[model samples]
Target: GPIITFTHDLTSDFLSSPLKIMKALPSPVVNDNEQKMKLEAFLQRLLSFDSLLQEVNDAFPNTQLNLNIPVDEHGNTPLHWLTSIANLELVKHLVKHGSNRLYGDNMGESCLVKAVKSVNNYDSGTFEALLDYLYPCLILEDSMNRTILHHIIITSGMTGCSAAAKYYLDILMGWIVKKQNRPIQSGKDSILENLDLKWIIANMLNAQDSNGDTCLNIAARLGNISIVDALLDYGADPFIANKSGLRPVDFGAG
Candidate 1:
């Protein structure tokens, strides 16, 4: 009896996959007060500079109450849906409740990340606010063991965010310096003394991406003159080669 119930419930055929489940879910056909509010919030994002955000805030002070509820068609939370629509004021209103920032989608991309990704052009005020919102939550390492600095560097390189690249570099250097100066516990003194700076340098020098390019190689290839100068100053091996046996200078030249 137990086996039958267990197998029946656990079977791939019986279990509703995300797509199938989404299809079977009931639709909200009626346009009631709640639905009107949700739509209004959505619209405010499009016409961002208007009074709609204030209206929404007045009506729904606790934006976090239902903001993350899954919606139809796109399956995006309100935060995710609003990211690309050029709405700074409404975005700020949403941030006030601190709900939008916490909403992560199925793809592991948080609303903040989506907003950052959507920002292709320059908007100093909006970008500064976005960073201020996200600064508290940025962890040192991501799922792939890459630090926030690493992700910033990678994204900046790909997206041509030169200013963001410089920002991350400065942040990382400050963090590293602070870490180096932090007081060690009495018993940990031995470990601190035994810390291997050369080992770290060696690893960094030998590190390669999936494409077999070292960090130095990438910096050089990207024509990031400042980063090249940094790596050299840090004593990164200039002779280190990729799979093609090309050195940092070769990549830098090309």
Candidate 2:
């Protein structure tokens, strides 16, 4: 069996210590499969990449870490795999070293979406890190036209009103209440075309998925009371009709 997964999906056993197996990775090989597997193995389970880079410089003087290369048919980079397991320190170091934060896989799930979909805890460190890195930028629509908020609702429901879901929702509380301490990006102004981050999040919250369900629309339809209320607080326009011509309120179990 393969010790490392180069596919988009992560195994639970692999996730426990996502990078531990890298120490045992065979010396660099020329095969495509092995190249990606080696990189991903190196990314996870390391206490720090600072030392890894030192070794890389000496051992493989001509090779640069292929931070953006797709390791799977799904096109998920090492960052996606790490975020899929919510490995914060490993993810932070990978991203700090220029892993593509916004790049998604063939499924349209970026590292941020990976963080949201991986939300199995009250607070996801991966989500928080991606939030900082991706701030002042609105997540683009997936093929389904669902925003990251859409996944938040779907995953939140998966865990039975999970605190993880609520934790994500409440960050909008940060978007609503606190605007300080945002990550500082040295290039491109982080703010696209002069639009503020708050303005960007408003559209994100109210985004319509393929089914035309806003985050609020999905919430009320699923009977997620607090999720719906938080969307409302995020200034989600509750009356907007979905593709079925039913407003979010129209599908409410209430």
Candidate 3:
């Protein structure tokens, strides 16, 4: 049997107002001394200072610095957390102290993945900080055949909120335009073929998740032309056929 862990979602609404939730439902983990100590240790490890880095180097002179140690079940490293939070100071410290920028999670997602996933309006500050770290790395591709731009576009497009979704779409479109002038990576060929900017924008406008539908389809089915127009502005093609051979314009008409 697989090990069952009661992991909480970081993006849960309860986390948005942690104090209120904590007051209502007491936490068992925090009440334990052992857990408290472990938590403190984790925090110290994450919040390490330059002096601590020096002390660590002095203690083990031959030890190499690696900031890519996994701190979560998903294999997110400290740099991942710092990037997700858009902590510029923490990111700079990690890099200066020797953090691996190319670290990947269990699913092959990177520190950049956390940045893309954090598309909510509340975390734009963190998102900018994460971009600062990722801009250098975006020039490089990884094993998954994905780039930070792909991740950002997919993640932000997946969200249902208009403002947040539009923010990501625009950012991704801007990057795509900029990349047109740059030297191409060998791996970028497949990504370019499969997720071309025009196709992706079109699909996203009329796209659905695992369910058979499009973003514009859903909006149109519900009589929301504003979203349809927004999606079209990003180059979403209404005439494109989906798996069912149905076009987005058809959905809008229906």
Candidate 4:
């Protein structure tokens, strides 16, 4: 037998360039497999490279790659995962690719809800990015019937009483006030007057949840005096009652 030396380079180049490898491969035929490929595993792998994700979608134009397909059993789309990871770049990429920011998970929690609830730190930039992309999400309710405003107060508690947390609170409130005043067309050649913050405070500031507890009610119960003050400054009604008929002042007594 002729002598032959066998040598194998053990470096796993694919790990370093998985997207490049996928690019080189012939595009998969668009069919059931294409749909199946839009699952958690595929999305998790592509999340790191925005251009590569776009390239994959471009190569499979007929696959409806940007559809609001659930990438997990919980009905989480790729946007939900991207938002959870706080990768704003990937989130914007997915949105540009047509992912629905309003799509919710099995729990009726939208990408915006996940984004707000997942802010582990007081990152004002993250909050602003979410607002810029999905401002209307501020008023959307989750399965718990809690609005984005409710979650903002919750996050403030989670992040604790600090300057960073206060900064986030201020920015979120500012964005809310600005959004409430956005101009809208009432009809042809007719425009609805911009709603002032006072009007918003009068109407929406006392929005209740499944438990019928308004943001001010929660703030008062938590003894978060600053938050209560802010809510009051915006016109939160201290006399509003929850489903149990307890007023915000009652919570303050605790």
Per-residue lDDT over 64-108 for candidate 1, one digit per residue giving the tens place of the 0 to 100 score: 234445454544556556654546545555555433343345444
lDDT of 2: 0.57
What's model 1's lDDT at 132?
33
Please write out the lDDT profile of model 2 over residues 2-74, one tens digit for every residue.
1111222222343233222111111122355544554665655353468887765465445556677776676
Tell me the alpha-carbon RMSD of every candidate.
Answer: 14.1, 11.1, 13.7, 16.4
Q: Which candidate gets the maximum lDDT versus the true structure?
A: 4
lDDT value, residue 229 of candidate 1 = 72
> What are the per-residue Cα lDDT tens digits for candidate 3 across 190-244?
2222334654443333344334444444444454455566666765556755457
User: Candidate 4: global Cα-lDDT?
Assistant: 0.58
lDDT of 3 at 19: 16
Best-performing candidate as measured by TM-score: 2
TM-score of 2: 0.71
Model 3 clash tally, residue pairs: 5
Overall local distance difference test of candidate 1: 0.45
Question: What residue pairs are clashing in model 4?
Answer: none
Of candidates 4 and 2, the better by TM-score: 2
Least lDDT summed over 10 consecutive residues: which range in candidate 4? 1-10
Global local distance difference test of model 3: 0.49
Residue pairs that clash (backbone atoms under 3 angstroms), model 1: none
Clashes of each: 0, 2, 5, 0
